[PDB]
């Protein structure tokens, strides 16, 4: 277990760029980490966005969030640059603004301020 509940992380999921997240406990399984059906470690994350979402993300697709400027280092893992949809960039900028606010908080404070409420 490399990450704990309330840790800020970048997550790389599907067709989307490295996204600011916060590690959290899955509401059903009540764990923030598990070993998947392929034997790989996964972490449960909340995505910082105007559209709240959660996901189990493979450990190779999770990186410690040190600050928004770290983004370029993640892509680095004539020169080619991919464009981004205007709407996606707007939501990413919103997520980053939340992550930057969360970064100035203690783990205890950000868990209090950002952990999602789940309704059946
Ligand atoms: C799209 C999506 C949909 C669902 C189920 N409705 C679940 C998840 C986890 C995701 C998701 N997957 C990876 N990312 C980065 C997101 C995502 C999450 C929050 N806001 C976003 C805003 C965007 F502009 C683009 C993507 C996202």
Method: X-ray
C-beta separation of 56 from 36 below 8 A: yes
Alpha-carbon gap, residue 33 to 49, rounded angstroms? 22
| Resolution, angstroms, 1 dp | 1.8
Residue whose CA lies nearest to ligand 1 atom number 6: 53
Q: Is the shortest distance between the CB of 73 and ligand 1 below 6 Å?
A: no
Q: Quote the ligand 1 centre to 6 CA distance (angstroms).
A: 19
């Amino acid at each position: 277990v490399k990450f704990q509940v309330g840790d800020l992380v970048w997550s790389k999921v599907g067709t989307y760029p490295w996204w600011p997240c916060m590690v959290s406990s899955d509401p059903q399984l009540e764990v923030h980490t598990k070993i998947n059906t392929r034997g790989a470690r996964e972490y449960h994350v909340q995505f910082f966005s105007n559209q709240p979402e959660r996901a189990w993300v493979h450990e190779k697709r999770v990186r410690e969030y040190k600050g928004h400027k770290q983004y370029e280092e993640l892509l680095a893992e004539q020169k080619i640059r991919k464009p981004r949809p205007q709407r996606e960039r707007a939501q990413w900028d919103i997520g980053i603004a939340h992550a930057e606010k969360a970064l100035k908080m203690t783990r205890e404070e950000r868990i209090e301020q950002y952990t999602f409420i789940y309704i059946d």
